[PDB]
Design a protein around this ligand. Structure first.
Ligand SMILES: Nc1nc2c(ncn2[C@@H]2O[C@H](COP(=O)(O)OP(=O)(O)OP(=O)(O)OC[C@H]3O[C@@H](n4cnc5c(N)ncnc54)[C@H](O)[C@@H]3O)[C@@H](O)[C@H]2O)c(=O)[nH]1
Ligand SMILES: Nc1ncnc2c1ncn2[C@@H]1O[C@H](CSCC[C@H](N)C(=O)O)[C@@H](O)[C@H]1O
Length: 257
């Protein structure tokens, strides 16, 4: 596959060359003031991570429409959860994450709809019984310099979320490594069963081939993955290039009824 060629070439990059490549021609969120505020103890207004902006991209394009009971698998600090908490048709958000030493803890916030949002750490999501939900979010996948390792990890995530999906559930699931043959095969089957397609978020860094399986989209799996491999290869050739920034999400404040 093209992605394997990309991955091989990425792994051959020198340290400085890699850091440069990672950010070339990508989108970034202006996070400085929000982070400074969070550290100050401020709980209104702020996204807890750059993950809120990342989910906003899919949502404002209608590729996923969170509504009702939202489950957020691998919530971390709660960026996706808090974001979803403020959305018109959302009634409940449950976010679950590892946390603990070495991993990001949920951050208590008072952004708009926070009372709708419950976050628990100390949770391995692979061992919890699926619950009924109207939207399933998952942002899980640990990168590896070996794409076969990433394939194994992606398949586990895919079989994970397959257990939480019913007939007309909204969804946005990170596909850590969408280009490996075993993952293509699984995604093809999952698309027959549940529709949606793989979409590339321009806030993703060049060092990752991640695409997101979103419910409200169409597209041949192979072609959509290949298009991104090509793009990522093309980006090796950019010289003295850097990210373009955008303002952060304002998540407001106060409770919802
Ligand atoms: N040529 C390079 N490639 C790198 C480097 N760091 C990461 N990568 C590649 O990007 C991929 C995404 O990296 P990400 O930004 O998600 O960082 P992670 O730490 O989660 O990736 P891991 O694969 O878990 O790597 C862990 C660490 O291992 C080191 N690493 C990983 N791959 C390399 C390579 N190839 N060469 C030198 N050093 C490497 C580097 O310090 C990483 O921080 C990764 O799988 C590698 O294929 C790097 O420093 N040089
Ligand atoms: N098996 C597992 N169970 C629960 N959490 C997991 C997990 N494997 C990885 N994770 C967690 O999932 C998180 C993904 S971080 C995702 C960012 C988040 N969407 C945001 O907006 O802030 C990581 O913090 C990691 O610790």
């Amino acid at each position: 596959t093209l992605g394997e060629k990309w991955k091989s070439r990425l792994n051959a990059l020198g340290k400085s060359e890699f850091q440069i490549y990672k950010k070339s021609g990508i989108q970034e969120v202006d996070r400085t003031l929000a982070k400074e505020g969070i550290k100050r103890g401020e709980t209104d207004h702020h996204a807890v991570s750059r993950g809120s902006a990342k989910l906003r991209w899919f949502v404002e394009r209608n590729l996923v429409t969170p509504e009702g009971k939202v489950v957020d698998l691998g919530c971390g600090r709660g960026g996706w959860s808090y974001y979803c908490g403020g959305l018109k048709n959302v009634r409940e958000v449950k976010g679950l994450t590892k946390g603990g030493p070495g991993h990001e803890e949920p951050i208590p916030m008072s952004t708009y709809g926070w009372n709708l949002v419950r976050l628990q750490s100390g949770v391995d999501v692979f061992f919890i019984p699926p619950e009924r939900c109207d939207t399933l979010l998952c942002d899980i996948g640990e990168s590896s310099p070996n794409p076969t390792v990433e394939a194994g990890r992606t398949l586990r995530v895919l079989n994970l979320v397959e257990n939480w999906l019913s007939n007309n559930t909204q969804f946005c699931v990170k596909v850590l490594n969408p280009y490996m043959s075993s993952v293509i095969e699984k995604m093809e089957a999952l698309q027959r069963k549940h529709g949606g397609a793989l979409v590339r978020n321009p806030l993703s860094r060049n060092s990752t081939h991640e695409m997101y399986w979103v419910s409200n989209a169409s597209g041949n799996i192979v072609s959509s993955v290949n298009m991104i491999s090509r793009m990522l290869i093309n980006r090796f050739t950019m010289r003295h290039k850097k990210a373009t920034y955008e303002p952060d999400v304002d998540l407001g404040s106060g409770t919802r009824n």
